[PDB]
PDB file of C-alpha atoms and ligand atoms in Angstrom:
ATOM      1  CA  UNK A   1     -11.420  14.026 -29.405  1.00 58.46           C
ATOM      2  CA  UNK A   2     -10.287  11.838 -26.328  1.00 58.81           C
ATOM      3  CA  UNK A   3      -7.370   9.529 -26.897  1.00 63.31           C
ATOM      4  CA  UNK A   4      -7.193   5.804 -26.218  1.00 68.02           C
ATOM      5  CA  UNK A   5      -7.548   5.498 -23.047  1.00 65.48           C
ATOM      6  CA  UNK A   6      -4.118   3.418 -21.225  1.00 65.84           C
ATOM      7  CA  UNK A   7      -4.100  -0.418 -21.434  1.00 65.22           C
ATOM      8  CA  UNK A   8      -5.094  -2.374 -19.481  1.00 67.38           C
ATOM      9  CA  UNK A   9      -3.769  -5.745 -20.407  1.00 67.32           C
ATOM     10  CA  UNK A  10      -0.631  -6.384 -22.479  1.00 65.35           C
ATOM     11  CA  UNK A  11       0.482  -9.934 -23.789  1.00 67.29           C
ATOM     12  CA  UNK A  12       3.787  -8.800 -24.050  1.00 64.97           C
ATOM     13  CA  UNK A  13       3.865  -7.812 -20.305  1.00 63.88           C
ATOM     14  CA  UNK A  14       4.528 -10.591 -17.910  1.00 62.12           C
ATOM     15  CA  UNK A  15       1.727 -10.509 -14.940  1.00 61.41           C
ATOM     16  CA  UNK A  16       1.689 -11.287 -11.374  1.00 61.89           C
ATOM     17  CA  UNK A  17       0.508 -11.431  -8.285  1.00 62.94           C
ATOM     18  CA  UNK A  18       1.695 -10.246  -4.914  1.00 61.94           C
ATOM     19  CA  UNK A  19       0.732  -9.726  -1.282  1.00 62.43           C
ATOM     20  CA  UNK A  20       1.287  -6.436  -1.613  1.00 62.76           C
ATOM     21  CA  UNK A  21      -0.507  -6.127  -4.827  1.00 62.40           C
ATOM     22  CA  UNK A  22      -3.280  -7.768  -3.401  1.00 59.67           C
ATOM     23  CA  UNK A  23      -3.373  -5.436  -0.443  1.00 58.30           C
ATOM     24  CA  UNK A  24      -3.642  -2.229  -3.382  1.00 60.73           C
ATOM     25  CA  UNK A  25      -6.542  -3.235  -4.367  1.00 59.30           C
ATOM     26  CA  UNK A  26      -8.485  -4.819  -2.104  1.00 56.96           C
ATOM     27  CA  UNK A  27      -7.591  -2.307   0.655  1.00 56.25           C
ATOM     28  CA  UNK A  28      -5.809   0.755  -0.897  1.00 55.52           C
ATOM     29  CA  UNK A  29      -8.140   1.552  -3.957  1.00 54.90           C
ATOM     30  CA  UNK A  30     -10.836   0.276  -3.403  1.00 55.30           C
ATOM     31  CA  UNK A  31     -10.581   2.545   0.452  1.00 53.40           C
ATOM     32  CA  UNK A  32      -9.749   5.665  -1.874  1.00 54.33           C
ATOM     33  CA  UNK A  33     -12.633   4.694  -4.436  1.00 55.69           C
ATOM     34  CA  UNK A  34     -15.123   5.452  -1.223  1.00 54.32           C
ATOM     35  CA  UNK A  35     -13.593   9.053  -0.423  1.00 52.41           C
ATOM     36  CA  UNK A  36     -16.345  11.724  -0.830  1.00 49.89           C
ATOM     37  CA  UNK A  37     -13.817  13.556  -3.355  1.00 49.50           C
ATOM     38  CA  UNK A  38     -12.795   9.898  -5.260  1.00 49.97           C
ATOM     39  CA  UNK A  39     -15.421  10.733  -8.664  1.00 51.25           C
ATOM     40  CA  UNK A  40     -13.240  12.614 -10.750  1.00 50.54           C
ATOM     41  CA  UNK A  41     -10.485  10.199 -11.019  1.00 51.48           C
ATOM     42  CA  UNK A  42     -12.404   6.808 -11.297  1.00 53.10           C
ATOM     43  CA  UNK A  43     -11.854   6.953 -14.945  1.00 51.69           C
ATOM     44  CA  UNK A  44      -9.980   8.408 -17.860  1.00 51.22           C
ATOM     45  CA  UNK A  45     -10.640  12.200 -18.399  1.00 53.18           C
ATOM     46  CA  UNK A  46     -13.029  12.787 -21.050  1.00 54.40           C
ATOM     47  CA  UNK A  47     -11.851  15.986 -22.164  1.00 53.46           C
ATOM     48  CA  UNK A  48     -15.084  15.643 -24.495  1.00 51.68           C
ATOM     49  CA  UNK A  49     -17.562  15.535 -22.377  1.00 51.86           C
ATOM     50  CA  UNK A  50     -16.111  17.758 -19.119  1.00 52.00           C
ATOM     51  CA  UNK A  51     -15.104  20.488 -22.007  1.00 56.20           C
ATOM     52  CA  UNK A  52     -11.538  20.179 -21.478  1.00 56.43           C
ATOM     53  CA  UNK A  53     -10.102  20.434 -25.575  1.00 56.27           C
ATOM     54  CA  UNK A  54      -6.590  21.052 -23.725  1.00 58.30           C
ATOM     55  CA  UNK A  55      -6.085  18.524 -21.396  1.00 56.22           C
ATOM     56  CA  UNK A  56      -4.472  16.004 -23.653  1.00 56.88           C
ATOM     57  CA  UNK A  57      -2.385  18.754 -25.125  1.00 57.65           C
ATOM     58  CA  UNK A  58      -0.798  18.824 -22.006  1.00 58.86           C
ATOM     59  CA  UNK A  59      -1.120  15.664 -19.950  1.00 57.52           C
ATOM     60  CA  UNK A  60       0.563  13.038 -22.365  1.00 53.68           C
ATOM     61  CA  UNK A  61       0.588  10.136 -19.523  1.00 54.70           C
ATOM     62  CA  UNK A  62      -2.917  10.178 -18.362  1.00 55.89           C
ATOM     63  CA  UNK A  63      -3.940   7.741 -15.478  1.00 56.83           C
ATOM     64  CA  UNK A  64      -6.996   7.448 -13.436  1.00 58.43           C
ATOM     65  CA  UNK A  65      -8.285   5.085 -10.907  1.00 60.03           C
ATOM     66  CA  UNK A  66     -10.930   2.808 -13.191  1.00 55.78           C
ATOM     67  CA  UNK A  67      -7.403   2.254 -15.204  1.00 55.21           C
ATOM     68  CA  UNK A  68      -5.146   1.241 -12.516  1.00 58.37           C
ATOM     69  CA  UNK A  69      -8.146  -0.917 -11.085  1.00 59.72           C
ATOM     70  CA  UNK A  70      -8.800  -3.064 -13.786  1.00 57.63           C
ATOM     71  CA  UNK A  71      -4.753  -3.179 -13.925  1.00 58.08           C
ATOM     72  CA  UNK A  72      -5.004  -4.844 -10.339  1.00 57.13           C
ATOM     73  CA  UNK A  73      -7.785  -6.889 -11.515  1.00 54.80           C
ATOM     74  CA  UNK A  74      -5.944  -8.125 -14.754  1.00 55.21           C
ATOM     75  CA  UNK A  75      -2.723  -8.978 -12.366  1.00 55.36           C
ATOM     76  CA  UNK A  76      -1.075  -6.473 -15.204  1.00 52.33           C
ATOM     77  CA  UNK A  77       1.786  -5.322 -12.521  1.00 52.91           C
ATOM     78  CA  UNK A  78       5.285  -6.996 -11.851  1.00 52.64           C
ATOM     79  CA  UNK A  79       4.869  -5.101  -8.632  1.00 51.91           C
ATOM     80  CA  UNK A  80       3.224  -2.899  -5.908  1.00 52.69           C
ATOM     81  CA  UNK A  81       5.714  -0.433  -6.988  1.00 55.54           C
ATOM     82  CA  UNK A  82       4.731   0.028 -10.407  1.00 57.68           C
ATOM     83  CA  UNK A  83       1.199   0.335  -9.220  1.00 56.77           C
ATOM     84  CA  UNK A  84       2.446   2.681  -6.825  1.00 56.46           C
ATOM     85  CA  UNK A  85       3.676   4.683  -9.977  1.00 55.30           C
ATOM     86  CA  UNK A  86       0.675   4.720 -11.423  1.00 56.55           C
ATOM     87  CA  UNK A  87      -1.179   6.538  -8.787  1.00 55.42           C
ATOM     88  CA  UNK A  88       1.652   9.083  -8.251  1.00 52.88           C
ATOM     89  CA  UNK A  89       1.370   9.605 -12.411  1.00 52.24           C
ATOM     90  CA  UNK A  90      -2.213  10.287 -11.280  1.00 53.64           C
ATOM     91  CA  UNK A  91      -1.969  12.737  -9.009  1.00 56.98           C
ATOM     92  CA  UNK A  92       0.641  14.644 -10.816  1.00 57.31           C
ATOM     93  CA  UNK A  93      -1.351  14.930 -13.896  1.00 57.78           C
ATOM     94  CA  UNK A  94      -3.689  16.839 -11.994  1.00 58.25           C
ATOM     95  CA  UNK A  95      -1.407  19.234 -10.053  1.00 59.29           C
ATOM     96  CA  UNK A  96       0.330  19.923 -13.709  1.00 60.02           C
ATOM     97  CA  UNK A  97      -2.634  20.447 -15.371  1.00 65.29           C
ATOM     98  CA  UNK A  98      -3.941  22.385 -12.521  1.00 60.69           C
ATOM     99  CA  UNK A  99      -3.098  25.549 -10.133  1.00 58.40           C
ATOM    100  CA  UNK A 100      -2.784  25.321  -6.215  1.00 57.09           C
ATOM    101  CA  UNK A 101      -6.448  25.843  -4.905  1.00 57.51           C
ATOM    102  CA  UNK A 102      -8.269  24.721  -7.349  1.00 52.91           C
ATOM    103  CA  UNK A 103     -10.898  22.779  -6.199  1.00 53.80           C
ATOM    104  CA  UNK A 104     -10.157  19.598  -8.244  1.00 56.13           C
ATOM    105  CA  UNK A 105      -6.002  20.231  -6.704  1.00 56.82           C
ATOM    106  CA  UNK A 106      -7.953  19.923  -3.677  1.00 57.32           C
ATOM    107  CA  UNK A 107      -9.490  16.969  -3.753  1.00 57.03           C
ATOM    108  CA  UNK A 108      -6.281  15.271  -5.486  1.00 60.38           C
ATOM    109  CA  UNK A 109      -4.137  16.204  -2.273  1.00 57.99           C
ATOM    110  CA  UNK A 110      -6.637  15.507   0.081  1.00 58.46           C
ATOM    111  CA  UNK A 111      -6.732  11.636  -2.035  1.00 60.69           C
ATOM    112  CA  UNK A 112      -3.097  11.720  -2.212  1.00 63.76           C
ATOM    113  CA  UNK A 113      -2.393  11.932   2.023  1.00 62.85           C
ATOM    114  CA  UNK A 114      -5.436   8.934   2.196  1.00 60.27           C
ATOM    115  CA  UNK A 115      -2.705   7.143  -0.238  1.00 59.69           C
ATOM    116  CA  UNK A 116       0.170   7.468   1.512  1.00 59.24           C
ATOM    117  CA  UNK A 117      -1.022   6.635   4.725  1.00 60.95           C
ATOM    118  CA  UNK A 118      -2.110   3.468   3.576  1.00 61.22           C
ATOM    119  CA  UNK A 119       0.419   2.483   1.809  1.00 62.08           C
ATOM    120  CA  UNK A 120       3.232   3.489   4.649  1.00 60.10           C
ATOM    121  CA  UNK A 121       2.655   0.236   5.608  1.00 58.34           C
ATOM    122  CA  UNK A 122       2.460  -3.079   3.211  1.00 59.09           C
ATOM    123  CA  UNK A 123       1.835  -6.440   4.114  1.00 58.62           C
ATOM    124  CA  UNK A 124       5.048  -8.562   3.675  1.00 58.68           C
TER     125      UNK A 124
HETATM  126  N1  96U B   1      -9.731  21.343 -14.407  1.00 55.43           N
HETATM  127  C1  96U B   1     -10.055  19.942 -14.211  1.00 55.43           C
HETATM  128  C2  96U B   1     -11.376  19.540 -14.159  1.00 55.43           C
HETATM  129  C3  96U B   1     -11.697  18.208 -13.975  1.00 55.43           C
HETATM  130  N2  96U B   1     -13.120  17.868 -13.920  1.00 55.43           N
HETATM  131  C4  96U B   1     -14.127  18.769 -14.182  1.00 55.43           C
HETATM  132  C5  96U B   1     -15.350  18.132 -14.017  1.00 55.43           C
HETATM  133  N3  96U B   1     -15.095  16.812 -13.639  1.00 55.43           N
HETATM  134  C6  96U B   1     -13.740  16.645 -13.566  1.00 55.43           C
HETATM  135  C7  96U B   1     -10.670  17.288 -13.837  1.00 55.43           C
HETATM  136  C8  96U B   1     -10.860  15.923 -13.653  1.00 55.43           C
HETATM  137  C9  96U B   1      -9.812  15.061 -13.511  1.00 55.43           C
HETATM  138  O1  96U B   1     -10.037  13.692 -13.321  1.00 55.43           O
HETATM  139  C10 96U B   1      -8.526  15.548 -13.565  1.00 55.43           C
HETATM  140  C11 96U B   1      -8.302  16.889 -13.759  1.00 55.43           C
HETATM  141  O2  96U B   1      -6.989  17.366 -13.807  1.00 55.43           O
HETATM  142  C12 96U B   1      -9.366  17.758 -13.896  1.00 55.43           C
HETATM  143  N4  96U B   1      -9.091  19.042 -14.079  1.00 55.43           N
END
C-alpha cells in the first residue's frame, strides 16, 4: 500500500515567485527531466507496482521530480532554496534506501552532478 503521495499545494503555505525559482524549473528540472537516467524519479515511488513493500518503511520523506514540478508550477516555494531541499531530500532517499553501485545509486549521482552544475550559478 503506497502512501499519499507529498502535497503539492497548501493554503496555509504562502506562495511565490522568484527569478531564481523560475530559472528551477524552466531550466534546472525540466534539463534533468531529459537525462537518459531521469525515469525513475519523475514521480512518487510506487512501492506497489515496482515490488518495493519496504521502501516506505524506510524512506519516511519521499520526494520525486513530478512532485517538486508541479510544486514549481503551483508557485508552492518561498524560495529556490527550499526547492533546492527538495531535490537534495530526493537524492538522499535513494542513496539511504540504496547501496553504492547499485544501478538506480547510479543514475541518482550521475542526476545529482547535472544538478549542481546548474544550479552553481542562479540568475539574480
Ligand atoms: N531499489 C530501487 C528501485 C527503484 N526502481 C525500480 C524500478 N524502477 C525504479 C527505485 C526507484 C526510485 O525512484 C527510487 C529508488 O530508491 C529506487 N530504488
Amino acid at each position: 500500500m503506497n502512501p499519499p503521495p507529498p502535497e503539492t499545494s497548501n493554503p496555509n503555505k504562502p506562495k511565490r515567485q522568484t527569478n531564481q525559482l523560475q530559472y528551477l524549473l524552466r531550466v534546472v528540472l525540466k534539463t534533468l527531466w531529459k537525462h537518459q537516467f531521469a525515469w525513475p524519479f519523475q514521480q512518487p515511488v510506487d512501492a506497489v507496482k515496482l515490488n518495493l513493500p519496504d521502501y516506505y518503511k524506510i524512506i519516511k520523506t519521499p520526494m520525486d521530480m513530478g512532485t517538486i514540478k508541479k510544486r514549481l508550477e503551483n508557485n508552492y516555494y518561498w524560495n529556490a532554496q527550499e526547492c533546492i531541499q527538495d531535490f537534495n531530500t530526493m537524492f538522499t532517499n535513494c542513496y539511504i534506501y540504496n547501496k553504492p553501485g547499485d544501478d538506480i545509486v547510479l543514475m541518482a549521482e550521475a542526476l545529482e552532478k547535472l544538478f549542481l552544475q546548474k544550479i552553481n550559478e542562479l540568475p539574480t
